[model samples]
Target: MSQSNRELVVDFLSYKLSQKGYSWSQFPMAAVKQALREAGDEFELRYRRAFSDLTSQLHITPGTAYQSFEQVVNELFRDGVNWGRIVAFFSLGGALCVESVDKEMQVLVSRIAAWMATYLNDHLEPWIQENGGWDTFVELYGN
Candidate 1:
């Protein structure tokens, strides 16, 4: 497939991102959206623990360097990478984008989006490709 995880993920962020800022209007690309929004909606405790620990460190601020954001995001990956993990990768961006906008740091949204896309390609993309990429995820999880 010519498509990279970057396209799936980065575009998902935009699709999902519009959910945050727009007049609640922009939502399509149902392929990656369903692939992502499912796997993407699917993380709770994994996010609760990793995210709970990291945000407690006060790193989710407008002032935190993008490098620190990546470091904290990396912490979520320090444990394992499984279908269980697919959520936080997106949920990670989910929180970042949501809070950044709510906190008035909307500028950081793309920065977080960019960082996660690269991390996804380098680390998780290998295993995702091994399992035949996200379309397979939609097949398994989609109704």
Candidate 2:
């Protein structure tokens, strides 16, 4: 991914962290990096492939086209985070964030977000279904 794209991901993830009640002083690099790596890899292989199809239809270059893909990934990850946060928040005595300082809550939150992501991907399969499937796009776009 381009630096701008990576920065966008970091920006959004930072926003998410803030929303979850972390301050700039408390931002966790290790946690953010882990999330970013997982999300980046997931987007690259799956969501990016699907998006490359649409780009091919319009004859877009990867450098130019990838911004949209990155945006989509960012939004999906945000949604997943929110989904998990809602669950975790509600389950934790009606709080909007968890109270476990052992980072167990953080781990749970991340795992739940990942599960939500997989669920979202599964639900979206129908839209990507075609006679030739995702490969058709790769053949046309060089993505």
Candidate 3:
């Protein structure tokens, strides 16, 4: 409830990763894991087949993951940074993490998260804040 908009965002993403079995025990970090867990805690609420469809479309592999992520993001944002695209961005991040796990590229999970965090901080934050942060998002989309 008191979490940042990005908190809702990245946490929503964590729910997607954990859904694919990136179990709690596997990521025994410090308070960070707790934060992540708490973020995703209630965020376990919503997600859809849009997630499953895009997850496969992304296909995050080792060598090409980052490069392709850039391109895909460019395309996703080509229209505008609507709430829908932002959700897709998080879906993309979730796909990256889950695929990394499938590839035994666990390290990339954090790396991708960091990259997503950077994008959130650098670009998406202003849009989100101006648009009423995560609260507006919940009100409009949450059922």
Highest TM-score scorer: 1
Report the error of model 2 at residue 134, Å. Answer: 15
Expressed as tens digits, the lDDT of each residue in 28-107 for candidate 2 is 33343344434433344453233333323323222233334334344334554442332221122111112321233443
TM for candidate 1 is 0.71
Off by over 4 Å in 3: 1-10, 24-68
**Residue by residue across 1-143, what tens digits does model 3's lDDT show?**
22343454456556777676674233312333344444443433454444454446566655555555666665678777887677667766776677788788776666676567767776677887889865676555554
Flag the better candidate by TM-score, 1 or 3: 1
Clashes of each: 0, 0, 0
lDDT of 1 by residue, 22-122 (tens): 32122124665676676665554334544656655544654666577667667766786666567666776766666666777677666676667777777
Residue 123's lDDT within candidate 1 is 70
Candidate 2 global lDDT: 0.34
Q: Candidate 1: where are CA atoms >4 Å away?
A: 1-3, 15-30, 42-50, 61-66
Q: List the residue pairs that clash in candidate 2.
A: none
Report every candidate's CA lDDT. 0.63, 0.34, 0.60
Q: Model 1: how far is 91 from its true place, Å?
A: 0.9
Give the TM-score comparing model 3 with the true structure, all chains together: 0.64
Worst 10 residues of 1 by lDDT: 20-29
Error of 3 at 109 (Å): 0.4
